[PDB]
């Protein structure tokens, strides 16, 4: 039990390593261009994945990329799917166990020709098989509770890539939050 802090932190370092290993410059560049070209971004993440979706929407919105975050399925998610536009981007955060509403949101968007992106735990997972853009992270926990550190690091990379691409837009939003 006295080893539990070193085990936990060592494990999160391996999560970052497996994630860095599986990070592809081409996949990152294409995911970043899709985020920037969208007129509106929808991020869906439920259960364990909700915190990653909340982090990604905060980060996008903070950079001037208008984003809706949905952390529950049901009727609200169904009506969003019913109102999708070809200029939207649907990002699903979905890892094992794959909660069906997120996978269904990617499948519904894909069917309607709407660009899709999956932040997932395997390059052949159900959301990976559907989505146009796939980013993979390790999620291993020392016990049953998973760790979102690898998913959060992919979000950190995405935000850093956008901020370098469009610094004026990001600085402008920053000027308004600095005022509050």
> What residues numbered 33-92 form the site for a second copy, per CB under 8 A?
40, 46-48, 50-52, 54-55, 58-59, 61-64, 66, 68, 71-83
Q: How far is the CB of 145 from a second copy (least distance, A)?
A: 5
Q: What is the b/e burial string over 109-137, where b = at least 16 CB atoms within 10 angstroms of the residue's CB?
A: bbeeebbbbbbbbbeebbbbbbbbbbbbb
Complex with a second copy: residue 98 or 117, whichever CB lies closer? 98
Q: How far is the CB of 36 from a second copy (least distance, A)?
A: 14
Whether residue 132 contacts residue 103, with contact meaning beta carbons closer than 8 Å, is answered with: no
Which residues inside 91-110 make contact with a second copy, applying CB under 8 A?
A: 97, 99-101, 104-105, 107-108
State which of positions 123-152 bind a second copy (CB under 8 A).
Answer: 141-145, 147-149, 152
Q: Does 2 bind a second copy (CB under 8 A)?
A: yes
């Amino acid at each position: 039990r006295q080893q539990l802090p070193v085990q936990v932190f060592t494990n999160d370092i391996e999560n970052l390593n497996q994630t860095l290993n599986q990070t592809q410059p081409e996949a990152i560049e294409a995911a970043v261009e899709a985020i920037c070209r969208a007129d509106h971004v929808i991020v869906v993440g439920m259960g364990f994945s909700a915190a990653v979706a909340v982090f990604l929407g905060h980060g996008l919105n903070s950079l001037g990329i208008r984003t809706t975050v949905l952390t529950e399925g049901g009727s609200t998610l169904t009506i969003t799917l019913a109102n999708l536009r070809p200029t939207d981007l649907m990002i699903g955060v979905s890892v094992w166990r794959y909660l069906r509403d997120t996978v269904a949101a990617l499948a519904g968007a894909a069917e309607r020709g709407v660009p899709t992106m999956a932040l997932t735990d395997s390059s052949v997972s159900p959301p990976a098989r559907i989505a146009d853009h796939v980013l993979v992270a390790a999620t291993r926990g020392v016990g049953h509770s998973l760790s979102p550190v690898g998913l959060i690091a992919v979000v950190n990379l995405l935000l850093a890539e956008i901020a370098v691409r469009e610094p004026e837009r990001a600085l402008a939003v920053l000027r308004e939050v600095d005022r509050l």
